Structure 1
Amino acid sequence: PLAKDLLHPSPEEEKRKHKKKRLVQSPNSYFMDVKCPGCYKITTVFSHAQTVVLCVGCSTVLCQPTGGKARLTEGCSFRRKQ
């Protein structure tokens, strides 16, 4: 592999590296919209969340913090934004 064009990598090779060590670094996180079942309030909870996020009015539990990426509590409506 003497001639890997290491300034224009494929996005397949770019995806499956670390979030450091890339040609230009970028995070694996995102922000996600969560419809809790029973309200208008879309919450804008972070993907790798760390706190127990609660809803404003329908104040049941929304997500659970775990190892890397937050286990959502209820099977609830959901979309990745931006």
Structure 2
Amino acid sequence: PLAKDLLHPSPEEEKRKHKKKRLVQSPNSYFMDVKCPGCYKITTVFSHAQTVVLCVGCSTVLCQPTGGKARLTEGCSFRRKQH
């Protein structure tokens, strides 16, 4: 294709492309609210957290750091922050 519109890429190829190689850099990560069962407070956790996140009210692990994304412990609810 000799006439690809570089100015207005559709969001599909925008999301598939590498974070640096996008038209504008955008991180692939996000911040999440995490609900541990049996606890009322809410912890804001990085989606690619490199550390073990703990509840200050309960000696419970919330996420286990992995290569790409911190794996949340089972039974824990989570949602997104503002997309």
Report TM bin, short chain: over 0.9
Superposed displacement of residue 73, structure 1? 1.4
Local SS of the residue matching 2:14: helix
User: Secondary structure of 1:52's match?
Assistant: coil
For the residues of structure 2 that align with 1:60 and 1:76, how far apart are their CA atoms?
Answer: 11
Superposition CA RMSD, Å: 0.8
2:13 is paired with a residue whose SS is: helix
Counterpart Cα distance in 2 of 1:32 and 1:20: 23
Q: 1:36 matched to which residue of 2? A: 36
Q: Where does residue 6 of structure 1 map in the other structure?
A: 6
Deviation at 1:80, TM superposition (A): 0.8
Query: Structure 1-normalised TM-score?
Result: 0.95
Does structure 1 conserve the Cα–Cα contact (< 8 Å) formed by 2:62 and 2:76? no
Distance 1:60 1:15 in 2: 34
Flag as ranges the 4+ runs of structure 1 deviating above 4 A. Answer: none
Instruction: Summarize deviations over 1:20-71 as a string: whole Å, max 9, x none.
Output: 0111111000000000001111100100000011101112111100110111
Q: SS state of the match for residue 79, structure 1?
A: strand
- Secondary structure (helix, strand or coil) at the match of 1:45 reads strand
Tell me how far 1:75 sits from its aligned partner: 2.6
Distance 2:28 2:70 in 1: 13
Stretches of structure 2 lacking an aligned partner (at least 5 in a row): none
The alignment of Structure 1 onto Structure 2 pairs a total of residues equal to 82
Q: TM-score, normalised by structure 2?
A: 0.94
Q: Give the whole-Å Cα distance in 2 for the aligned partners of 1:78 and 1:21.
A: 30
